[PDB]
Ligand binder design. Structure first.
Ligand SMILES: NC(=[NH2+])NCCC[C@H](N)C(=O)O
Length: 267
């Protein structure tokens, strides 16, 4: 199928530094849940697939610049991001959590197990008041250009002393070095790291969903338009959603999630 054709090859951008979503093997080849899912979705469509590496900070500009056609990199679906790109339906959930080292004063919290910032209400606002007091006078680290940064900078938990790094591996090491007091990231990121490193990282407070954390992880695609590029982009959105539905019906997304996360993180 020639490039530009109705049914041509799809280039998918991923980071390669975010296990178990996307990572690199010892040979440096890209692996993980999203690599295997991308391949399965493109097989359903009957289109060829190429996976290419892209740094997280530059991921959305790179899509806009046409370095690739789709983002599959653990990217949460948010209304903010929908201002400039669009998403497929979600294929997996990712709850966020605060993490500290064993010994921290935050290990004595009593919050709900989870809160949803879109559903909101008085009990959620009270939990945020508690978190505001818990973070006062502490340093908190997170990955640059994430929902986690957005939340912390929002004022919803007060005026936070935020530290950021380009990659989640740096966040993990800032926390375990003791150089930062608290970190915010996906719960699955902290458990993947706790599992590999053996370091005593502990989740504290409620898990976070909704609001600045969005609603699941989806395929990021350029917004449709009327020029050649734009009608191809509209069709890619249509094809991805059909393929996700088919994969879900066949039990594929669930099976893959268990094979990577150890539990069914799929949507
Ligand atoms: N490849 C990565 N490092 N992704 C980080 C994603 C974190 C979060 N889900 C967000 O959309 O901001």
């Amino acid at each position: 199928v020639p490039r530009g054709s109705h049914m041509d090859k799809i280039k998918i951008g991923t980071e390669g530094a975010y296990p178990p979503w996307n990572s690199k093997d010892a040979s440096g080849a890209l692996i993980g849940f999203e690599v295997e899912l991308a391949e399965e979705l493109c097989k359903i469509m009957g289109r060829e697939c190429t996976i290419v590496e892209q740094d997280w900070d530059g991921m959305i500009p790179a899509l806009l610049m046409r370095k690739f056609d789709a983002i599959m990199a653990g990217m949460s679906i948010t209304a903010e991001r929908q201002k400039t790109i669009t998403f497929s339906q979600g294929y997996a959930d990712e709850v966020a959590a605060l993490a500290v080292m064993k010994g921290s004063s935050l290990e004595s919290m009593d919050t709900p197990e989870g809160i949803n910032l879109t559903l909101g209400g008085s009990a959620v606002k009270k939990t945020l008041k508690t978190l505001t007091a818990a973070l006062a006078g502490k340093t908190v680290c997170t990955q640059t250009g994430t929902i986690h940064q957005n939340f912390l900078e929002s004022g919803d938990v007060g005026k936070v002393n935020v530290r950021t790094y380009k990659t989640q591996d740096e966040v993990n090491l800032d926390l375990t070095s003791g150089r930062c007091d608290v970190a915010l990231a996906a719960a699955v990121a902290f458990t993947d790291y706790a599992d590999k490193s053996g370091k005593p990282v502990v989740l504290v407070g409620p898990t976070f969903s909704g609001g600045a954390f969005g609603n699941g992880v989806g395929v990021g695609i350029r917004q449709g338009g009327d020029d050649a590029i734009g009608t191809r982009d509209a069709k890619l959105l249509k094809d991805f959603n059909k393929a996700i539905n088919t994969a879900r019906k066949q039990g594929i997304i669930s099976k893959l999630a268990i094979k990577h996360f150890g539990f069914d993180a799929s949507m």
